[PDB]
Short mmCIF file of C-alpha atoms in Angstrom, two decimals:
data_model
loop_
_atom_site.label_atom_id
_atom_site.label_comp_id
_atom_site.label_asym_id
_atom_site.label_seq_id
_atom_site.Cartn_x
_atom_site.Cartn_y
_atom_site.Cartn_z
CA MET D 21 -7.71 13.18 -45.65
CA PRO D 22 -10.17 15.18 -43.85
CA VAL D 23 -10.82 14.32 -39.99
CA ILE D 24 -14.71 14.57 -38.51
CA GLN D 25 -15.07 14.74 -34.51
CA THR D 26 -18.50 14.14 -33.70
CA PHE D 27 -19.34 15.46 -29.73
CA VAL D 28 -22.81 14.08 -28.36
CA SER D 29 -23.83 14.87 -25.12
CA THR D 30 -26.11 11.78 -25.44
CA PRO D 31 -25.18 7.42 -25.87
CA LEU D 32 -24.07 6.28 -29.41
CA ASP D 33 -24.37 2.79 -29.31
CA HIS D 34 -22.79 0.56 -32.18
CA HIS D 35 -25.65 0.64 -34.64
CA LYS D 36 -25.25 5.00 -34.57
CA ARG D 37 -21.77 4.47 -35.18
CA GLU D 38 -22.00 2.87 -37.92
CA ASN D 39 -24.79 4.99 -39.41
CA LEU D 40 -23.04 8.01 -38.98
CA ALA D 41 -19.73 6.45 -40.37
CA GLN D 42 -21.84 5.46 -43.74
CA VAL D 43 -23.22 9.78 -43.89
CA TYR D 44 -19.97 10.32 -43.00
CA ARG D 45 -17.85 8.42 -45.89
CA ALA D 46 -20.75 9.55 -48.41
CA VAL D 47 -20.53 12.97 -47.72
CA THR D 48 -16.79 13.11 -48.08
CA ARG D 49 -17.25 10.98 -51.30
CA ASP D 50 -19.92 12.95 -52.62
CA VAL D 51 -19.41 16.82 -51.22
CA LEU D 52 -15.83 16.95 -50.24
CA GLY D 53 -14.60 14.75 -53.78
CA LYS D 54 -11.87 12.81 -51.42
CA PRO D 55 -11.44 8.54 -50.71
CA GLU D 56 -14.31 7.38 -48.46
CA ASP D 57 -11.54 5.25 -47.24
CA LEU D 58 -9.76 8.13 -46.52
CA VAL D 59 -11.80 10.13 -43.82
CA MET D 60 -10.59 9.62 -39.82
CA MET D 61 -13.96 10.24 -38.03
CA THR D 62 -14.27 9.67 -34.34
CA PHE D 63 -16.72 9.86 -31.52
CA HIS D 64 -17.31 11.10 -27.55
CA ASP D 65 -20.43 10.41 -26.48
CA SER D 66 -22.25 11.11 -23.89
CA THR D 67 -20.10 14.47 -23.66
CA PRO D 68 -21.19 16.58 -21.32
CA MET D 69 -22.64 20.13 -22.65
CA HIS D 70 -24.34 22.60 -21.98
CA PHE D 71 -25.90 25.04 -24.38
CA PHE D 72 -28.93 27.95 -24.63
CA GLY D 73 -28.98 27.20 -21.08
CA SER D 74 -29.73 23.85 -20.54
CA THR D 75 -27.36 19.92 -21.15
CA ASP D 76 -30.57 18.72 -22.78
CA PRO D 77 -28.82 16.70 -26.55
CA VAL D 78 -26.89 18.94 -28.24
CA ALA D 79 -23.79 18.02 -31.28
CA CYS D 80 -20.46 19.66 -32.14
CA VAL D 81 -18.81 18.28 -35.19
CA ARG D 82 -15.67 19.85 -35.88
CA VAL D 83 -14.30 19.20 -39.98
CA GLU D 84 -10.31 19.12 -40.44
CA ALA D 85 -10.10 19.66 -44.12
CA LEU D 86 -5.96 20.47 -45.35
CA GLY D 87 -6.41 22.60 -48.02
CA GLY D 88 -9.47 23.74 -47.20
CA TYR D 89 -13.18 24.17 -48.73
CA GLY D 90 -14.69 25.02 -52.19
CA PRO D 91 -17.40 27.63 -52.53
CA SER D 92 -20.46 25.23 -51.44
CA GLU D 93 -19.05 22.68 -50.54
CA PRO D 94 -19.83 24.00 -46.50
CA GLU D 95 -23.30 24.41 -46.80
CA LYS D 96 -23.65 20.41 -47.94
CA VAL D 97 -21.94 19.73 -45.41
CA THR D 98 -23.21 21.22 -42.84
CA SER D 99 -26.90 20.43 -44.30
CA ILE D 100 -26.27 16.94 -44.54
CA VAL D 101 -24.00 15.93 -41.28
CA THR D 102 -27.18 17.87 -39.05
CA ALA D 103 -29.81 16.06 -40.64
CA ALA D 104 -28.01 12.74 -40.43
CA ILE D 105 -27.57 13.82 -36.48
CA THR D 106 -31.02 14.50 -36.09
CA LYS D 107 -32.09 11.27 -37.61
CA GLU D 108 -29.53 9.17 -35.54
CA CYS D 109 -29.25 10.74 -32.43
CA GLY D 110 -32.83 12.76 -31.89
CA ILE D 111 -30.67 16.14 -30.83
CA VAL D 112 -32.39 19.08 -32.99
CA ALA D 113 -31.36 20.72 -35.39
CA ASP D 114 -30.94 24.45 -33.24
CA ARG D 115 -29.33 21.85 -31.16
CA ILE D 116 -26.01 21.22 -33.99
CA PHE D 117 -22.90 22.68 -34.64
CA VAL D 118 -20.57 22.19 -37.15
CA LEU D 119 -17.14 23.76 -37.07
CA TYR D 120 -15.06 23.78 -40.65
CA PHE D 121 -11.33 24.09 -40.63
CA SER D 122 -7.95 23.60 -41.79
CA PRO D 123 -4.88 21.92 -40.59
CA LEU D 124 -1.24 23.77 -41.63
CA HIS D 125 0.10 19.83 -42.16
CA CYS D 126 -1.05 16.08 -41.64
CA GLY D 127 0.57 12.85 -41.52
CA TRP D 128 -0.55 9.45 -42.84
CA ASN D 129 1.34 6.35 -43.11
CA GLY D 130 4.92 8.04 -41.34
CA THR D 131 4.96 10.72 -44.27
CA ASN D 132 2.93 13.77 -44.79
CA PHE D 133 0.53 15.08 -47.49
CA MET F 21 4.68 25.94 -25.83
CA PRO F 22 2.97 23.07 -27.70
CA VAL F 23 -0.01 21.28 -27.03
CA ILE F 24 0.03 17.87 -28.10
CA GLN F 25 -3.61 15.44 -28.34
CA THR F 26 -3.83 11.60 -28.74
CA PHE F 27 -6.54 9.92 -29.74
CA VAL F 28 -6.09 6.47 -29.61
CA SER F 29 -9.04 3.64 -30.22
CA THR F 30 -7.11 1.21 -28.45
CA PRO F 31 -6.57 1.46 -24.09
CA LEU F 32 -3.89 3.19 -22.35
CA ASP F 33 -1.98 2.20 -19.77
CA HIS F 34 0.55 3.89 -17.30
CA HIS F 35 3.22 2.53 -19.43
CA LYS F 36 2.09 3.98 -22.63
CA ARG F 37 1.54 7.44 -21.68
CA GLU F 38 5.09 7.44 -20.06
CA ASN F 39 6.50 5.79 -22.44
CA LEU F 40 4.35 8.18 -25.20
CA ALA F 41 4.51 11.69 -23.30
CA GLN F 42 8.88 10.78 -23.11
CA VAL F 43 8.70 11.05 -26.86
CA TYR F 44 6.59 13.68 -27.19
CA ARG F 45 8.82 15.91 -24.67
CA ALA F 46 12.11 14.89 -26.98
CA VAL F 47 10.63 15.73 -29.39
CA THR F 48 9.24 19.21 -28.40
CA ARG F 49 13.40 20.13 -27.73
CA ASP F 50 14.59 18.09 -29.93
CA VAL F 51 12.59 19.15 -33.08
CA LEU F 52 10.68 21.79 -32.32
CA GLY F 53 13.27 23.56 -30.27
CA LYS F 54 11.18 23.89 -26.87
CA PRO F 55 11.36 23.39 -23.98
CA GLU F 56 10.42 19.95 -23.30
CA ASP F 57 8.62 20.97 -19.52
CA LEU F 58 5.94 23.17 -21.93
CA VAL F 59 4.72 20.50 -24.03
CA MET F 60 1.05 20.25 -22.56
CA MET F 61 0.18 16.04 -23.68
CA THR F 62 -3.81 15.16 -23.17
CA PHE F 63 -4.39 11.27 -23.98
CA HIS F 64 -7.77 9.95 -25.13
CA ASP F 65 -7.51 6.39 -25.11
CA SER F 66 -10.27 4.32 -25.81
CA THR F 67 -11.60 5.92 -28.52
CA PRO F 68 -14.43 5.07 -30.95
CA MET F 69 -13.30 5.57 -34.23
CA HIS F 70 -13.99 4.83 -37.97
CA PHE F 71 -11.53 4.52 -40.54
CA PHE F 72 -10.44 2.27 -44.22
CA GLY F 73 -13.82 0.89 -43.65
CA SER F 74 -13.02 -0.40 -40.07
CA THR F 75 -13.34 0.28 -36.41
CA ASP F 76 -9.26 -1.47 -36.44
CA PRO F 77 -6.59 -0.20 -34.31
CA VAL F 78 -5.88 3.64 -35.44
CA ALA F 79 -4.76 6.84 -34.18
CA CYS F 80 -4.84 10.58 -34.60
CA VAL F 81 -2.64 12.86 -32.48
CA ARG F 82 -3.46 16.76 -33.25
CA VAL F 83 -0.25 19.23 -32.28
CA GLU F 84 -0.98 22.75 -31.76
CA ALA F 85 1.62 25.27 -31.67
CA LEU F 86 1.48 28.97 -31.86
CA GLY F 87 4.21 30.69 -34.67
CA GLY F 88 3.74 27.38 -37.14
CA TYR F 89 6.85 24.93 -37.49
CA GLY F 90 10.19 25.37 -39.56
CA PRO F 91 10.10 23.77 -43.00
CA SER F 92 11.34 20.49 -41.92
CA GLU F 93 9.59 19.47 -38.51
CA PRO F 94 6.27 18.68 -39.06
CA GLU F 95 7.99 15.76 -41.17
CA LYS F 96 10.58 15.23 -38.34
CA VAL F 97 7.64 15.69 -36.08
CA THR F 98 5.21 12.60 -38.17
CA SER F 99 8.23 10.29 -38.70
CA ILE F 100 8.88 10.05 -35.06
CA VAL F 101 5.37 10.01 -33.50
CA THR F 102 4.06 7.57 -35.83
CA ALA F 103 6.91 5.04 -35.23
CA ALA F 104 6.39 5.88 -31.56
CA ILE F 105 2.46 4.66 -31.22
CA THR F 106 2.98 2.13 -33.51
CA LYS F 107 5.54 0.86 -30.86
CA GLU F 108 3.54 1.93 -27.63
CA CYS F 109 -0.09 1.32 -28.84
CA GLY F 110 1.08 -2.06 -31.84
CA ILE F 111 -1.46 0.49 -33.68
CA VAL F 112 0.03 0.28 -37.95
CA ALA F 113 1.96 3.71 -39.41
CA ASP F 114 -1.40 3.10 -41.79
CA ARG F 115 -4.02 3.62 -39.61
CA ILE F 116 -1.86 6.24 -37.77
CA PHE F 117 -2.83 10.88 -38.58
CA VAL F 118 -0.55 13.72 -37.09
CA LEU F 119 -2.42 16.63 -38.11
CA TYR F 120 -0.85 20.22 -37.18
CA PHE F 121 -2.62 23.63 -36.34
CA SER F 122 -1.41 26.24 -34.61
CA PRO F 123 -3.32 28.41 -32.44
CA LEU F 124 -3.47 32.58 -32.66
CA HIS F 125 -3.25 32.77 -29.22
CA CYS F 126 -2.11 31.30 -26.13
CA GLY F 127 -2.74 31.40 -21.99
CA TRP F 128 -0.72 30.36 -19.06
CA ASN F 129 -0.28 31.48 -15.90
CA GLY F 130 -3.37 33.92 -16.92
CA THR F 131 -1.54 35.44 -19.63
CA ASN F 132 -0.97 35.43 -22.90
CA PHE F 133 1.99 34.81 -25.14
CA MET K 21 -21.24 31.31 -31.64
CA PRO K 22 -17.92 30.88 -29.92
CA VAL K 23 -17.21 27.18 -28.94
CA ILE K 24 -15.13 26.08 -25.67
CA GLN K 25 -14.24 22.95 -24.95
CA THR K 26 -12.48 22.50 -21.12
CA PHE K 27 -10.21 19.39 -20.72
CA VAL K 28 -9.24 19.12 -17.15
CA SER K 29 -7.40 15.66 -15.45
CA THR K 30 -9.77 16.23 -12.06
CA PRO K 31 -13.12 15.36 -12.58
CA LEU K 32 -15.49 17.75 -12.84
CA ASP K 33 -19.52 17.40 -10.81
CA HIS K 34 -22.81 18.95 -10.91
CA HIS K 35 -21.46 21.82 -9.16
CA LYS K 36 -18.07 22.58 -11.04
CA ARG K 37 -19.87 22.23 -14.69
CA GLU K 38 -23.00 24.83 -14.26
CA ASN K 39 -20.90 27.12 -12.35
CA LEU K 40 -18.28 27.35 -14.96
CA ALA K 41 -20.94 27.35 -17.83
CA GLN K 42 -22.12 30.64 -15.76
CA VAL K 43 -18.58 31.58 -15.80
CA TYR K 44 -18.16 30.83 -19.96
CA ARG K 45 -21.39 32.86 -20.19
CA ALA K 46 -20.87 35.66 -18.18
CA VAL K 47 -17.42 36.00 -20.46
CA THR K 48 -19.05 35.47 -24.01
CA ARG K 49 -21.57 37.88 -23.16
CA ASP K 50 -19.48 41.11 -21.28
CA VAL K 51 -16.00 40.48 -22.73
CA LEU K 52 -16.57 38.22 -26.49
CA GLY K 53 -19.86 40.60 -26.97
CA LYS K 54 -21.88 38.06 -27.54
CA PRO K 55 -25.29 36.23 -27.17
CA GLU K 56 -24.48 34.21 -23.62
CA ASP K 57 -26.96 31.63 -25.23
CA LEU K 58 -25.07 30.81 -28.11
CA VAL K 59 -21.73 29.43 -26.96
CA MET K 60 -21.38 25.75 -27.24
CA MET K 61 -19.75 23.91 -23.92
CA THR K 62 -18.56 20.97 -23.98
CA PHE K 63 -16.43 19.06 -20.62
CA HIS K 64 -13.62 16.69 -20.64
CA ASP K 65 -12.94 15.44 -17.29
CA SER K 66 -10.68 12.99 -15.47
CA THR K 67 -8.70 13.59 -18.57
CA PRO K 68 -5.32 11.58 -18.52
CA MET K 69 -2.61 15.07 -18.95
CA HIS K 70 1.17 15.23 -18.82
CA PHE K 71 2.73 18.91 -18.89
CA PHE K 72 6.07 20.14 -17.04
CA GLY K 73 6.71 16.95 -15.77
CA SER K 74 3.83 15.49 -14.10
CA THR K 75 0.14 14.24 -13.91
CA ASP K 76 -0.49 16.28 -11.48
CA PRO K 77 -3.77 18.89 -11.36
CA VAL K 78 -3.76 20.22 -15.03
CA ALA K 79 -6.11 21.91 -17.70
CA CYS K 80 -6.71 22.57 -21.36
CA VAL K 81 -9.53 25.11 -22.26
CA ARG K 82 -10.08 26.09 -26.05
CA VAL K 83 -11.62 28.39 -27.51
CA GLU K 84 -13.03 28.50 -31.49
CA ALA K 85 -14.77 32.02 -32.60
CA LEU K 86 -15.82 32.30 -36.12
CA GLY K 87 -14.49 35.96 -36.86
CA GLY K 88 -11.71 35.81 -34.71
CA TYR K 89 -11.19 38.77 -31.40
CA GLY K 90 -10.41 41.90 -30.72
CA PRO K 91 -7.31 43.43 -29.77
CA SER K 92 -7.83 43.34 -25.33
CA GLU K 93 -10.40 39.84 -25.77
CA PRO K 94 -8.24 37.23 -25.37
CA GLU K 95 -6.43 38.37 -22.44
CA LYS K 96 -10.03 38.73 -20.96
CA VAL K 97 -10.52 35.53 -21.04
CA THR K 98 -7.54 34.23 -20.38
CA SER K 99 -7.32 35.86 -16.82
CA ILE K 100 -11.04 35.09 -15.69
CA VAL K 101 -11.25 31.57 -17.35
CA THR K 102 -8.01 31.00 -15.42
CA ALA K 103 -9.06 32.46 -11.79
CA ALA K 104 -12.57 30.65 -12.74
CA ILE K 105 -10.48 27.14 -13.12
CA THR K 106 -8.05 27.34 -10.22
CA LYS K 107 -11.59 28.41 -8.52
CA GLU K 108 -13.43 25.76 -9.08
CA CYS K 109 -11.26 22.66 -9.56
CA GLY K 110 -8.36 23.48 -7.52
CA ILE K 111 -5.91 23.77 -10.70
CA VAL K 112 -2.87 25.93 -10.35
CA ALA K 113 -3.02 29.00 -12.99
CA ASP K 114 0.60 27.49 -14.16
CA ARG K 115 -1.20 24.35 -14.85
CA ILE K 116 -3.38 25.67 -17.06
CA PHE K 117 -3.63 26.67 -21.22
CA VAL K 118 -6.31 28.09 -22.76
CA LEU K 119 -5.66 27.81 -26.55
CA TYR K 120 -7.41 30.17 -29.22
CA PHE K 121 -8.76 29.55 -32.37
CA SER K 122 -10.61 30.68 -35.30
CA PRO K 123 -12.68 27.84 -37.92
CA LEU K 124 -13.23 28.87 -40.83
CA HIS K 125 -16.36 27.87 -41.42
CA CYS K 126 -19.77 27.01 -38.93
CA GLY K 127 -23.02 25.80 -39.25
CA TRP K 128 -26.43 25.57 -36.77
CA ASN K 129 -29.53 24.83 -37.64
CA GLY K 130 -28.69 23.31 -40.86
CA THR K 131 -27.09 26.53 -41.78
CA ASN K 132 -23.63 28.40 -42.29
CA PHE K 133 -22.81 31.69 -40.85
#
């Protein structure tokens, strides 16, 4: 049950959020080896941000997965998510961060896994 | 000094935020064994989200506590928070995540604990 | 490549966000010993919050740094960030939290570090 929070400084519309959600569903299944229905995704658009001396279009994506990551998984996720944010949002790769964490515990449907 | 961030895809009004804050104050004291005045709670309503193939009402609650959790605490917290979000927001349990982390350090009142 | 997310319950304007960004750039370089251009900062103002029995002006700052922190760094960061939030926002020190985490992995410019 991974969580992916997407912060961007630009506006997101239906089209971009759907396209990103489908990207994240694909990487959850294909790279993370997990069911795509179980990735919970939040979108935080028009976030005031500052990076490398400016407020120009920038993104920070956070990935949370219980049990951490396989050895080649984060590099793949970073590659795919970056290109997708550049595609959909027009944000340049050198203004995109992707951070990886793993929680200690995760509850879903009232119970912990 | 725990932190609880509540993201929901639905609107929260005064009534729901107060009711949730009182739920979180109670679980901090009764389950976490900590002073209820020291839980900091943030509310992020009307968050665009995607989960299990849809944007239907969904919640993600994050819990951060320095020093981690007792062996039965996360299951209790998850049970209480889930029911409370279902009660106040009408969000179904199988569309509610609760993630648990613990920071390395925490500052309050200008000093670290 | 640290990340600093600033949540406050009060409104932030251009002036406050610029002033805080410059504070965070300075502490990244001077305390964290890292390039100030590489701190990514997000600002989340007018966040509905609850703490110590009220919704009065309150702040939660999250700091994420790959590889963790030197022994005296978090205390310094907490001291500087707290005073700066009190200065710019008028939020009292005993209503300011600063949490420190470190991600497992970080991507920037399509690649992981």
